[PDB]
Amino acid sequence: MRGVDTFLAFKEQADLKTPATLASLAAGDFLAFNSESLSGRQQVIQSRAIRRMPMRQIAYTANGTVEAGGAVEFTTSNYVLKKLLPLIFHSKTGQEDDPDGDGATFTLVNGGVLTPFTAFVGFDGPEGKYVRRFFGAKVNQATFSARVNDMLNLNLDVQAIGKDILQPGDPGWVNVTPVYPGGDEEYAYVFYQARVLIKAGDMADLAELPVESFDLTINHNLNTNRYRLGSIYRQSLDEGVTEVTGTFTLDAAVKSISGPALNLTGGTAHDPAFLEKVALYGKYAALKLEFIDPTREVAEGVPCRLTIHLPFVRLEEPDFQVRDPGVITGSARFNAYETISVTHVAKF
Amino acid sequence: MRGVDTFLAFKEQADLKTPATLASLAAGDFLAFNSESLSGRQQVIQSRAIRRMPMRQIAYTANGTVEAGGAVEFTTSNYVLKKLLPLIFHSKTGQEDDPDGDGATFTLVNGGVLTPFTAFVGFDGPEGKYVRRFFGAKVNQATFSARVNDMLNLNLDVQAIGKDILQPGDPGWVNVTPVYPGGDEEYAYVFYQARVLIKAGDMADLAELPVESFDLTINHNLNTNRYRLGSIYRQSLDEGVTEVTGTFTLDAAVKSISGPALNLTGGTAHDPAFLEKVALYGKYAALKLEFIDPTREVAEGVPCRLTIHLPFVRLEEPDFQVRDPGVITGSARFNAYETISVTHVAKF
Amino acid sequence: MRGVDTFLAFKEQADLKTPATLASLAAGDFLAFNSESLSGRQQVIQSRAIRRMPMRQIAYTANGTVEAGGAVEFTTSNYVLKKLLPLIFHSKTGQEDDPDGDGATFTLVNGGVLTPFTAFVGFDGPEGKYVRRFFGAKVNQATFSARVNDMLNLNLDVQAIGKDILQPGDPGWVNVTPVYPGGDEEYAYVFYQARVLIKAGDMADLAELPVESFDLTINHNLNTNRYRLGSIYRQSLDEGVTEVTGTFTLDAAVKSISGPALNLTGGTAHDPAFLEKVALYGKYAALKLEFIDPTREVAEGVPCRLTIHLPFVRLEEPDFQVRDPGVITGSARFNAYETISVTHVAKF
Amino acid sequence: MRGVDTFLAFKEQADLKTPATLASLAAGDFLAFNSESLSGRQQVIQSRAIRRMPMRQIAYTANGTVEAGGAVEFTTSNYVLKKLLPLIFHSKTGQEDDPDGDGATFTLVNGGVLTPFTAFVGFDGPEGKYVRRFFGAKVNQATFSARVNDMLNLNLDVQAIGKDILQPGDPGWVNVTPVYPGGDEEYAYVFYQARVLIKAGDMADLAELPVESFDLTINHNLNTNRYRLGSIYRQSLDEGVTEVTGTFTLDAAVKSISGPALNLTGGTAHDPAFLEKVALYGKYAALKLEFIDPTREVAEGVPCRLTIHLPFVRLEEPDFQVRDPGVITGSARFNAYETISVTHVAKF
Amino acid sequence: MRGVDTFLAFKEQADLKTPATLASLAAGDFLAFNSESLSGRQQVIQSRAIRRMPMRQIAYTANGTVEAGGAVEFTTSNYVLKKLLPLIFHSKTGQEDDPDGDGATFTLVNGGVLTPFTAFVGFDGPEGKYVRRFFGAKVNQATFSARVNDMLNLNLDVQAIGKDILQPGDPGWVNVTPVYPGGDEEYAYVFYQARVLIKAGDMADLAELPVESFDLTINHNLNTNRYRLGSIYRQSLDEGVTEVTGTFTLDAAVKSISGPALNLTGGTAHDPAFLEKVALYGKYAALKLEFIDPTREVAEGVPCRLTIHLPFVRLEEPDFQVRDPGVITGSARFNAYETISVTHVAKF
């Protein structure tokens, strides 16, 4: 088997306990991924009755609860986002390809819940055909990452209720053929389309920072330990409180490329201690990570766009250490507080 | 001192507390090793009486219990196995060079015990001569490892009661000269002599797997904390329950090279999910790791052989992750349950 | 032995592990080559057991995995192409000597595989007779090269599973007599039959470039490291992704000899920065390397022909350096992307 | 196009990111060069999403960061030096044609910076007209070389932010006509005007060495890897620490032609191991490479002059190997330490 | 200085750290060499304290460890061998000019060590007199080379502890006058005195091969990195394991000139694949490189002789490539394994 012999398909399921059928998979369900590590683990119970034996005994071993889940990396593309953003957030408003050009907005709501889905990891190679079905899956974490000379990546940590293996002849088997968007239909976001914008203190508008890389993690803090008597499976994947953290790498005392000057008082003079003072005084800043593809138009004059609005953000000490006689660089970590919004303007 | 200036010699001792003498060492006791890390550690006790002092004080420090032990790697050869297999297992039946050709079988028995031995790490170089004697030693762990373009290695984790240093002029000193088997007498096992065989479900016989590497660990779980008032030494090295684990690396959907087809129902059709289903359904499989040297005959038509019979084995999820568009490879871990047997057919 | 005393014969084998027999060689298997460098290498394993010895020891050395392969240069002729193009590409459609005159087309297909073959390098000279048989061979790389005052050359880099030596008296020996096409039957392509055609931007048709030389490499990126326990041989030669690169030498600001004008907007005015702008704007160009022999007719009015269609090609900076007061010449490297096709129209 | 059809023009630009316009070029900007190799390279990004495809595909490729730069060789002449010495060093004091006759002195200062410039490589030939503009250029390295029967050459390694192509009809195009100094106005330095002077230990003055050739490299160690999200271009060319190295070829045990005797104690007796002892004892020597043209007067009795003052220099082992029964010759490498000064006395 | 103005003298020193005095040099110490490249290198340490400075600073630079060594080429002659063979090998038995005629035998012993020596490279020319003394020198590598129309050459790679320069007036200076053997006393080995003999398989005796050239390298693998705190010098030159490799050039399928036929079964029929099969089957062969000067008698009927016995040798694939229609020639590389012996029968 080769990685090209395998397909990945997420499909949303009505109830957490009812896996999607392998015959319902259609266009839009199959995603091109960078790597998958979904797996299931069964727990083994050993009787505590003391017995003389040189080694473990089959008659006195039982198997207990099962876990399922793992990571999936994606290159954040057009259809990948269309499929995954609804699985990462609670509410969606609008349509990406809305003609007016405001796209779809994804937010976390007060008592919102995550959509459960079934992950199919199918294999069709010279050795044969079989599908790993992970049912009752939820996105536990989602990291957006942007590096130089790279694309925008999206790493999902998924928790599931259980795994099973479907093979030709099983009661729920269909010989599925993955269908993907055309090469001319699917688009990705590259590093040179990115813009990190910050605002703090009395700054009038968002000023663009020259960062080298950025990461943004949404962590839903699912409770993956709700077991009961009479079942080896998790009984739910209840979501806790969403923790939105992140990091971005940039120099010490950087000036803004565009927008106002980095100055907590809104003045025109640059503050070489801007981020350090933001971190030291516990100020709240507004971030905006924005990808714009001008070469792709969604409306009359509206380009493809992926904006992440993080109003109210608290930075840790920016980590600007004097390590050598060269340029002082560091990574500023941050935690988002009140809300996170994601607007995706895209045409399909 | 150089590593070539040193010798290693294990010798079996009647009682755990009576070290073997340095004059009893003879042919068969000295082993060629890859590396040794046997050492002793003394514990330092510091009085808790509160006293004003800028630093620790010699008058208020005592030294407590001592540990000894460490690792020794070997290239699993003819005489190395002859010497070490009796130290790793509880019972031996037969003789390796038995003319009929079934060799010696080493197994763990119900209430069996490990043989204690003394490890001599001797040095004889331009600087002088001295022996590190580790008395009351037992094999705590033993790992067999096979890699491609390598030999079969055996790593022993040894626990001992204590260490001492013998030097010219001590009451128990003898100027020992290590004697080793002739180059034409000693043989090793190479990777291309190895065969991993598996069996599960209704499979009729053992089918050979094409694995890239394998490891098998026997862990005797010695209790190394039995101290008493009136002695700085361990009072015993009581063995717990032997845990036999292992791992082997191979591809997803491997087909067997020889034997039947990998099929849990004994059919002739290949099952591309064989190991995954073995792990997911908690089935017990039979493994057999076997080295055969046809170029070395022990009987009329019986070749040198080292077989490790692991009936009843439980695999973890085989770890077949889609990491890249190339061949999907992974490592299947396993735990052995009821018994482990080791047959060594060898001529000396 | 002289190079004239040796023959070379490729023969296609059903399975990668079953070498072709030396008795199956017939007309069409024997090829006239410029030079061969096929060879096998055995790996030597040295025991890591530390031992005092001034030099390596025979008793403590083992031999490990084997590689085989090397290069073979051909003068791209009639029968050479007939034999080798099926070994370099995945799919073939048509017959070279098809009466209609479209020849055979060789392409890479989505999940296509390379044909394994056995290479016989036989020697029959005053010293005696013996054959080097390289079994399980695949074409790893194939370079087409055209220079002025030369013929079209084809250099193959071949990887194989192993080598063996056949001699009179061996179980698989036949006294083979090489049979070759008649001098009046075999034809080659000369430099003055070549045409390099390019197209980019809005150019309406392919415009001919005056190049001095060209090279085109197909690289199948075989995985030559798939070894296992129990075998010194490679277990497969799995092909990765085919990388098609190349280079052609020409002057700076060249005009086209025929076809439209080199103009990214399809106009009639020449663009002296055509290739530089193609490389700087990351445009995709279409190349066509075409050999035509009008003196050899395959159909009523169809000449012998070897066309290499490379639609979608990306040039690197054309390398037009001002080195001296003479004509500015340079080499434009390129990488092909979507597909490569090779049409061979030939009569045998 | 011929090398005579091309011109080269450097022009200093106010900010690193604002290229000089092609209409601002005037007398003094155009330089006669020996060879140019300025070029730009775009990086190509390949999506990591695993997909079945025989070859790279266009829809899944993006292009990333760009580099620009290359080498330019000059014959160190009057106006070439006037133009380039200000680009190689940090500070200039004086005017070459100062009547008093001390010329201009170029030095590296503590926190000094390099001047950014735009390099125009223009072509105007039978094929047409177009300019390669390399904007944001800095001198990364500068080598002065003197050989026998040659002129003094100056090789610049230049790093730039990016390249673009200007052509008739572009928004910033002007039909520039290169203007050069008259043949009777421009002068060069020949080998027979050179003098290498050394001083070490207690030597009272500088003693002239008879060297066969010399090289002196200034290396500014620019940081050419400062990229950010949202731009394919380098964000700066920050200069590190200037490393000034060099080499000169001469015979073993050479005596000085003029000045004192080569003697680390200032005595009149020659030391045949002078350079070897300077290198072995880690002594610091003072070098002075000086070109004087007596036939060209800049003041009443002051000739044209190019002096390179390298106080404090450390030689490596002079490389005086006995290779043959002839004269022992070798090359002494050196590293300059504290400061480097360059005085140019010239009339224009 | 000319190469004829210099002398070279090795002298054996009692301890590695005590250089031989320049007054102890006498007849037999001075050797005629082809070329020397002995040199010393001092390491320069740069403080890591970050400081603003355009260039390195003398106050913040220190110099560290020193290396010494280099190559010396000799024409393997009578006295050259007498002097150097004891420095290349561990043990010597016998005297070259022993009347019985078995000469001196040089071998590597189990725990043998190399003799340290001091190398004097003295210069006495019109410029003056001075000696380079390299103390604590050991032979790291020694290559014997034989070509057609050449003499037998011996290239030594020497590692030393340090270098110093002695000059008239130093505390250890003596005006040494080199004394050499008379022209009528010294003899060399020419190519036409050479014989390469091979034996493998069941061959009864050594059969002579017609080779074009040969090389044999002894490599002692000295550890040249044993430095300590408080010293800039190496603390030892500990020798590792001696690797004896070599190569000889010959034609493909060569027959033996004398001795038995090249046949792995001892038969009288020639095997055209002899060396290829020796390399492919991993057989061990016995080589013997032997120079005999019949015109020089050491005993009543015993001629001058230099034999290199290499029992047990493993050849790589002989490198017999079909490059052209002429005779197939190649080079067979080999590694010696168990022992190497060198017998020198010589009269002085």
Author numbering:
A (entry chain D), B (entry chain E), C (entry chain C), D (entry chain A), E (entry chain B): 1 to 348
Authors' description from the paper:
The hyperthermophilic phage P74-26 is particularly intriguing as it has the longest tail of any known virus (nearly 1 μm) and is the most thermostable known phage. We find that the P74-26 TTP forms rings that are trimeric rather than hexameric and assembles using an abundance of hydrophobic and electrostatic interactions. Each P74-26 TTP subunit consists of two β-sandwich domains: an N-terminal domain (domain 1) and a C-terminal domain (domain 2), connected by a linker. The interring interactions are mediated by a ball-and-socket–like geometry, wherein the tips of Loop1 and Loop2 each fit into a socket of a subunit in the adjacent ring; Socket1 and Socket2, respectively.
Micrographs of purified P74-26 virions revealed flexible tails with a stacked ring pattern. Because of the flexible nature of the tails, traditional single-particle analysis could not be used; instead, we picked sections of tail with ∼6 rings per “particle” and used a segmented helical reconstruction approach with the helical symmetry tools in CryoSPARC. Iterative symmetry searches and helical refinements revealed that the P74-26 tail tube has an overall C3 symmetry, with three protomers per ring. The tube is helical, with a rise of 40.25 Å and a twist of −44.75°. Our final reconstruction has a global resolution of 2.72-Å, according to the gold standard 0.143 Fourier Shell Correlation criteria. This resolution allowed us to clearly observe every residue in the TTP from the N-terminus to the C-terminus. Using this reconstruction, we built an atomic model of the gp93 TTP de novo in its entirety, which we were able to trace unambiguously. The diameters of the outer and inner surface of the tube are ∼90 Å and ∼45 Å, respectively, consistent with other known tail tubes. The P74-26 tail tube, however, has a markedly smooth outer surface with no additional domains or protrusions. There is density that runs through the center of the tube, which presumably corresponds to the tail’s TMP, gp95.
